[PDB]
């Protein structure tokens, strides 16, 4: 069957077990079926992948893997040994087997080997044994498949895991030719689309890759991932992927925002898209409408609120990687126009103009009200009762509100170390606002 | 005696109780004595301050207040009712008293009333009873002082809490004149310096404020606060405050970084200063911190601290990379005695390598709690230096190539900041 769900596949602080249980609740609520465990910086997933879990760690994994079963979500355990492993040393191979067995005894029946972002060339001993980097990965992936008894679901993420990472192209890649041929027919292949973060995943691109790897891939979708930029959050709907892909694919797993509570939209809309033909804008409405209920006012026994419009504003400000939501783009166009047409100056060298200065002013007030809606959105969100949500999003909301606050001032006015060192180096690169509207 | 320690006084995710216990450990380890609880976004501290703590909330505060006593750290409970309180309605006043009693029964004997970020506002009904905003605040602050039995430590943070917030200046403020006169002698006054985030706290500025409020203030120090800027972290030493201030002050509480594990340097160096050379204090603190990791070297931490140093200053290795990159960009047009450009480019490209190395070893460390609290910030700097290294490379490879810097369709991280970033670029800052 078709895999649809979430991969916890991002860099940084991983999610905690209470959060993952709440995740399984939601995947079931929305009729998704899969979870792939692959947090890049849970140390025993990648950095110290040889190390067996301690007894108190094992108690938490088995408790987690059983919540997965309790909630009818399939649990796929991933391991990323590609960094420093010697493929031909059988102690390494045995260590990998030992590690998998251990998790299997916690009651896990599905697995994955990830070879994402790693040096293309092996050590000396390995070049001796294997003809290519591809051959080495397959050989151990197959061996491990078989050693585990050819389990229900088994995933392999290649080093050339998207269009732009294929040397020299997708169709003629010796690496992918080798995966297609030698990887055992029951092992599945993860693929992120044309790019690492794909704006669109066109059907023809999936036909093209499927030909060379001899099967339908499972999409690891980075569309809502935000690990690569401190300032970014993605609350927009699943988008750029035709429902026509579903027959051509073995699954879709989203790698979403690091901040757990910020993924309501990202996952609800994936679900909506799975069950459909699909309208991003309508899926967002469904998802925002449902999300609103999760934001209380606090209970009060002594005394002397977030709306749907607030959430719509918030999502349009923190939307998708290649697109702002309509209320965000509107405030942007309007502010550009105001700055451009600020010839309502006292030091005026066009005498004046009645009509053109009435328009500027009129549009400034209208804009100053839009800025108010941002401040209002922040105020009511900080007054909400679900603090877990407030905290997961606080810095992002504060930021936008403070900057809009300063933009409002600046427009009014028309009538320094910020970002820190990183900010200062950034301003000096001349591609700083190179994708701005 | 004299109050020195930490205020948990910032906006955002507050610290958790395990973190606060570990904090009390450290304050004692380093001979600090105080903690002020005032996280802006515990809902019952400020927004819904009338509300009593629930049973499960009360169980956690009692458990926390007793760890404070266990570790010989004084615990001061703050409350920020300034937003919507009616000062003249005695139900409001009673509600405030009810709330304080509740915390006292959790075993807490020290308190504070905060009136920080509030608009010089009275509702009517209040303007009827009280002649000014200042009069109204003191009247309830005094009443509450007395009602609690005039406790050991009691703090009052004024609305005019720093130089730039005093109308029209510090010396002639009717607001502060009124606080100085009518606030009872055993209540203390919190003050953040000339600014909200003070670069320096000069002695004369403290003499000046002490005169008008008729006592020595307790400094709420925002020097290492990072709640106001997503991209900023402060690992530099306590600085800009003369050791001559210590006799002129009733205390110093730092309001430090939101990310708990990032405050080792910020608090160790405060302690060192409480007994001064900033660069020697940093060395003491970085040397001690290195042990808590585990492979990460001292040179790695020195680089990291210099990259994320202080609000008005970068550390020497950071400022150096900056001046050198400015020079390279400025003098690129010559790509006769410009073997110096090339030479300086390679030398710079090696500096960028040390950043990548620092990040690599930090992600391989065994103290994951620390890694996570700082991960975003370290990734960011590494990615940006990585792109700076490229750009310098590209500048050099230009006598043999006329390719664009960005070649074709990019991944989103090439273009930083999102919508916030785009509005920022449109301001002149």
Author numbering:
A (entry chain A): 59 to 334, 373 to 400, 552 to 662, 680 to 701
B (entry chain B): 59 to 333, 374 to 392, 552 to 592, 602 to 695
Pull verbatim passages from the article behind this deposition:
Recently, our group and others have independently identified crystallizable constructs of OGA that comprise the catalytic domain and stalk domain, and published the apo form structures and enzyme complexes with active site inhibitors. Exploiting our previously reported construct of OGAcryst (residues 60–704 with the unstructured insert residues 401–552 replaced by a glycine–serine (GS) linker), we solved the structures of a mutant OGAcryst-D175N (catalytically impaired but retaining the ability to bind substrate) in apo form and in complex with each of four synthetic glycopeptides.
A structural overlay of OGAcryst-D175N in the substrate-free and substrate-bound states illustrated that substrate binding did not induce any changes in the dimeric structure of OGA.
